[PDB]
Amino acid sequence: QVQLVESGGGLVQGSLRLSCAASGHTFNYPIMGWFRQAPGKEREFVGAISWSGGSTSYADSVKDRFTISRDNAKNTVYLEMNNLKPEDTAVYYCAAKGRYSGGLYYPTNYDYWGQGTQVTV
């Protein structure tokens, strides 16, 4: 039982900081993923972070552009969207992954989906 609230979707052309605040049984769901949904297109992997350890992985598109990290005190994950581009125009969603729930990349493996911040540039 996880609740995800995302915030900080602004407008740029630029650096941006999406945030993702979790609450509930976050222990059972050690992985947080960032997805983004362009109008029409399928839901697309951006990156993922382990709550414990901060082991990070990125899609190629956002590799060395975006940076994820967390703070376990607040139970918060952030996508630091630097060096933005007009391809990076989508409804960015946050989601939680179970420990044994499969590959990082596949949105069907994820159970608890945040609302989804729209970001346009």
Place this chain on the structure above:
Amino acid sequence: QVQLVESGGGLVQGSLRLSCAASGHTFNYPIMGWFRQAPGKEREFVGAISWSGGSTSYADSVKDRFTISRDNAKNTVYLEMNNLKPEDTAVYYCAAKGRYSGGLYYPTNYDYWGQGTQVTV
């Protein structure tokens, strides 16, 4: 990531003391090897020492002639070249070997090569 600086290449006919000063991640590279390159010929094994324990091995040519040892305080290895001969005329190189990197004798197993002191007699 290992750096090797070698020094003490003099001229004799005699006893000589080559030294080999290491710095960096020497833990991952527990073995130091001595090679020597005569003009034209292939790179040739001389001897090797473990940093921890000082377990030593020598090529036949230099067996009971040369002696290697170390001091872990300075992270230094020395080739004590006693009883020199005109065959012992080469660019002597120092090199570091990984823990699981294969046989002592084979220079392709070694990753981090010192500059190489020229020694002529």
Place this chain on the structure above:
Amino acid sequence: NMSFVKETVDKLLKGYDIRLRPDFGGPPVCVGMNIDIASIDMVSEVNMDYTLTMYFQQYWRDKRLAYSGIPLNLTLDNRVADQLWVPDTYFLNDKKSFVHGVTVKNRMIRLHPDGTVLYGLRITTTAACMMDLRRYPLDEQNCTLEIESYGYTTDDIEFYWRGGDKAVTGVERIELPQFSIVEHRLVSRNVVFATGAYPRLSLSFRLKRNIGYFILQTYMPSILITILSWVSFWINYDASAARVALGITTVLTMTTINTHLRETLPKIPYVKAIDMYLMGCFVFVFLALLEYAFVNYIFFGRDVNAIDRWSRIVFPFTFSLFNLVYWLYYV
């Protein structure tokens, strides 16, 4: 159409010689490796090893197994693996490993029409990892898994990471309480032995020990005992029983802390950071009692307030210096 598939597979294995690698006598067979890390169960300083569970996949082409007229990939029962050639892959730094066997051998064989074989195993391995404990418990370790061909040289077989930097998945799954995975790296090289040159793949992890447990469990009790020892210097010098009792008891408390502690660590011949700290703290509390002996020696036995006053400042200041030097050297 099960008779047709059965016929096709029977034909593939008819006269198949498991003894001969694909393209025997020709160019080396390229074997692509792919690991999915299920878990790292344990890291042992005392045994200098770690325990890894992974899905180990091997990818190669065997033209002897090519089949036509079936546009499917055939997933076969794991027992077919015993009728096929497979690479002689081993883990050079492993101590003890097994393929899981319940409810069946955790093994997969998938054939492709072009003769590509996808061979998967679920393996738990205890693998050696020599650790440098000079900075323990403020240490960073490099634990590797070395993957090599046992008997085939690079004339006969070649390894590569299938997918390059994506060949290893699941590093985010690793949940070791005592370590964080800082980084992983994939390496490929050739390793030369007396019997020839062999292909090698190396997977390594950088493990960083979390300090938090050690600050509270070992460092803080030591700090509080050492500070406690200083209380003596503010006690009246005529209170001989009180001040000698405080000195001894703190010393003995420091011994009980030390000896209990030593059941958690390997029998290393070198000084860990924590050993150096505890030895320093012991010396402080020992000097505090010896300080009283000096006061005791001249007041009664032969300024007394002056010696105490110097001790009230010099001991905390020296401990601050000791801590400053220590934590700068090691952090």
Place this chain on the structure above:
Amino acid sequence: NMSFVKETVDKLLKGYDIRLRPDFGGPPVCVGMNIDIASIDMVSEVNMDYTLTMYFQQYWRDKRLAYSGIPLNLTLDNRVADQLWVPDTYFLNDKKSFVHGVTVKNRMIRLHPDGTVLYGLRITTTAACMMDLRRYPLDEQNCTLEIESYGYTTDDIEFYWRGGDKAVTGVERIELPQFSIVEHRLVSRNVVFATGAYPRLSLSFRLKRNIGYFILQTYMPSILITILSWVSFWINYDASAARVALGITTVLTMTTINTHLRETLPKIPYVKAIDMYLMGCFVFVFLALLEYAFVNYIFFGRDVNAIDRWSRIVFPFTFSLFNLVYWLYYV
């Protein structure tokens, strides 16, 4: 009529290809699972695992095994299992498991006239269970058993809990001294990997640690030592030997309790609830001795009853506050 039954079974297995799943190339085979939990033998915090014994039953239809003219279900010797296709089921989070082998392999095969196969195994498994020990020993854990097809995707095989919420029996049999089973749940889903989508069944239990042992063994001695430390404040301030002895000895008693305790737990880098309590209690007894140093420092060395009188109230009240905050946060 044993020759007739022998003939029928021989005919079933004649030309049977174990390599091919039922309905190979067609719709997936539906496999119904059913577990009877014999025991949960052990739960280990230090190894982060638990040991389960169960009767694991699998239920599917193989039309190749359909037989006519015998209105019985045939129970066959367990060795027949080696001549049949069975699912490639494994436990994804298991560490070590085996099928019991005395006096025979604890395995059953029952065939039905329509080709339904009932395959039963008695398995003991040690399975991983990552525990959150932040609230230990007031913690609740979620230990799971993850059941999956190793090599067959959901194109080829499907799992379901046979009987829905009654597919797992024997939860009432579980008798762990240190835990109560609050709840169990059955889940079904598909899990996607690089090699495809695989069927998954998950059995989880909610374990609740019983506090009683810890209150008496660790909490109460700590409370009594801390209260004992306060006796000093009612002792005459001239009794320097007595009051310093009481302070030190209680501190040292608190160290012996702490260090002994630490042989029962894993080397976690975070603060358990019990660690926080013991660290708080240590600080209290340490401050009680330091309180005397302050009294000692000004009475003799330079109101004294006033400082003691404040200590007589402030220390128990602060400990009450400490306990209130602690037990509210954690209970």
Place this chain on the structure above:
Amino acid sequence: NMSFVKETVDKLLKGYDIRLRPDFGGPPVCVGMNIDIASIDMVSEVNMDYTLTMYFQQYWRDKRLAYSGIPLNLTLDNRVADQLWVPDTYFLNDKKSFVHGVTVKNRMIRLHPDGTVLYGLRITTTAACMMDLRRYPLDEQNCTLEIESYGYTTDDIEFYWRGGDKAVTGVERIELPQFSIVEHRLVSRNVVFATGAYPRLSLSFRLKRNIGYFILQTYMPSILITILSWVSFWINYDASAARVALGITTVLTMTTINTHLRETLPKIPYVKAIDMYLMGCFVFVFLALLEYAFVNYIFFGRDVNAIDRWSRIVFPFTFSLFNLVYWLYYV
């Protein structure tokens, strides 16, 4: 040309009798041994054993396996070893050993046109090593591995170190924290039993314990407690509570150090060096308290400064003598 190679190998094994050694009934078969030491994982004083991992290669000629018309050395899948004669080599002083089995049996077979067989195994062995702990922890041990033919006498088989002094590689790889490898030696001899004379090869290592850990962990605390005990002699003889407390507490501290220590060592009936030291230190601190009893007995009870003054000199001097004799005898 795989059919030709398959034909050749099939011909080699046709009518091959594994029961008969090469040249049965003729001169002994010469078997050359070659070891590559991967690791020495553990050395146990308590179990009197050590754990070795090595690549064990055997070299012999079997004229039954000679083949013509192929100018290659054939590396064959390890399963061919089951169709060949191999020597019946065993490790006479081994306690428990196994051939690694992941992902396959870590075994190699290489044939040569002249019928030379190169048979390699990767073995982990726990082998007995009786240790002389009289000088522990200042001891030097001789741990051996004894290699012998089980059933074939020297009439039927002979062993030699292939390469003489280079037959064993990888001694530099051995990284035991508690020991340094001083030397290794290779020996060859014949060993006679009731059943006949058997070939023997012996590999031995000289292990030297590093003192550093023991000086700091066991020797230095003991020295500091013994010195601490002497402080009593500078304290006023009227301070009965203080001086008796110091004597007892140091004695009890010396007991806690001793008893904790004894969980690290085997239950030997003889005196280790460290046992002798700790017993000496105990006697010193015991005599220091008894010294006060003598002072106490005559001052009050019936020169007092004279007895203390003698103690101030005689005790440190005797401890210096004790240490001198000890460290000369043992170093």
Place this chain on the structure above:
Amino acid sequence: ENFTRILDSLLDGYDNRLRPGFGGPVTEVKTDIYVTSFGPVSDVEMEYTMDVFFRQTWIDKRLKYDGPIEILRLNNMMVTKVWTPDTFFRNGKKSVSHNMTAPNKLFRIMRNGTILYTMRLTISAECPMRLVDFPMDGHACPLKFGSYAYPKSEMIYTWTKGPEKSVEVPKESSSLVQYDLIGQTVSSETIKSITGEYIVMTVYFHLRRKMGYFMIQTYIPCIMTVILSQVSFWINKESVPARTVFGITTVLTMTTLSISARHSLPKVSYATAMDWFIAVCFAFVFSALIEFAAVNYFTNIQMTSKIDKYARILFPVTFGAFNMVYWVVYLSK
């Protein structure tokens, strides 16, 4: 095929499921044991480990051959093709047959048909112990082996050499740590069961424990502690805190020593000899503090001591008397 035909002929028409001389005279199997190492003896588990060269000798006329050579030293895998005795160890708990680098089995066939079948085995056998004199105790660890299915009327067991020479335990082979192998006795017995009556061969190893370890670790510190408790008698009665601290900490020291001895002590209901010594030494330390209680109480009511003067003499003597009684009872026998 000079010897291949000979081996094939012997194996042809041979059934390994039938003992030699089936249906006739009993099959006499001669056995001898060479103990390569006598592993550690676990007092807590009442078991001992031992590595032996278990050799079995018998005659099988079905395998006799005529040829030039007299002895056929064959491979270890030849054993599975011939009949072998079903010898098992009755008191063995966990026994392992070594398989490195090949199955450690020897198989030789003589011309007359004599078969020598030896195997290297690591045996963990039950050794029940009476730990009432511990650590001054000696135990006889047996090793009983016999047929599992063939009764006396079908197979009997004998020692190949003389009963003393059949079992050979070299001194160097003694891997005992805290025990000394005084000697071994070799005997053959006969037992009965529901299956039948069987011949049992027994080897008894007489082990004597060495008390040097327990003397230094346990007895000497306890003797020092009780002597240290008696020191308070010579201390002046006016120093109440000094003597009070002396008694309480000596008890605390005794508890630490007694607790430490528990880890090495095996868990048995009956108290061992060392347990009695520690318990009595505990009483002496406790009585020493009680003695000061009487001294302090009496002098304050009346407020050098007669109680102290007698305690200075009686206490050392009565502890010495206990030692003579304790040691003579246990160090003897």
Place this chain on the structure above:
Amino acid sequence: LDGLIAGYARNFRPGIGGPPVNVALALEVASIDHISEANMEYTMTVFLHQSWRDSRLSYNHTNETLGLDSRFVDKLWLPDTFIVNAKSAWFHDVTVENKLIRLQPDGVILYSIRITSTVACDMDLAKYPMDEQECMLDLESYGYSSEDIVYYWSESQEHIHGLDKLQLAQFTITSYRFTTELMNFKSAGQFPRLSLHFHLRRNRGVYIIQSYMPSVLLVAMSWVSFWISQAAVPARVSLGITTVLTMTTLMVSARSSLPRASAIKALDVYFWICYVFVFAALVEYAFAHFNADADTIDIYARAVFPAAFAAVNVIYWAAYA
């Protein structure tokens, strides 16, 4: 012999689709060791004897029983007997597989195997160490229901049980019982179960007195402070604190040598009875020292506490014995 095996249906029980096969069972308990209350298990080595009649193996060429080795075992059909409460079990294979087959001319088969099994035994440690435990050895067919295999104790079981000869280090077998549960009623149907119940009693603990007695005289040592004068403030305080320090060592060192399972044992209860008494003795002097600024409290404590400890001992020992 060989002809019987050729036409032998190994996969099928004798008389399939007919009356259930009667199997006689007998046990020869060689030893019982490793009785661990921490792991709630015990290790037992037995000679399991199974007797049943198979008409397919009947022979008439001779009137002598056929003594066969372990090789012939794989050929024949065997009952799927398994131990229900066994955590782990295995066969002894040194120097051969410890199996025997006795084929009578009538067709009765004697199947004996030597097996060592670690059997789970639920132990209630509420009265520990003055506790009596009952452990069981359940045996039943794994796959064949009552319609196929029926188990019953053989008449010889009463004589060769061997439980009397057993000598346990810490327990005594007070009684043993053989029971036949006809209807286990598992999921697959009715399964007859043969269970051996033997009651284990801890041997009137004397090692517990090695632990009880030190606690008894420690609280007696706390009472020594009462006879000490009120002026000896350092002496009485030191005696009180060290006794608490000594008592804490005794309590926690037991847990190292005792099982770590979360249960409140009688041995624990006695420790906290001792713990509160020594704790009360020290706080008693706190009132005595504070009220000094009399000996009446000391006089009362000099008799009430020794009497109170005697009273609580009577309550403790009577309840647990």
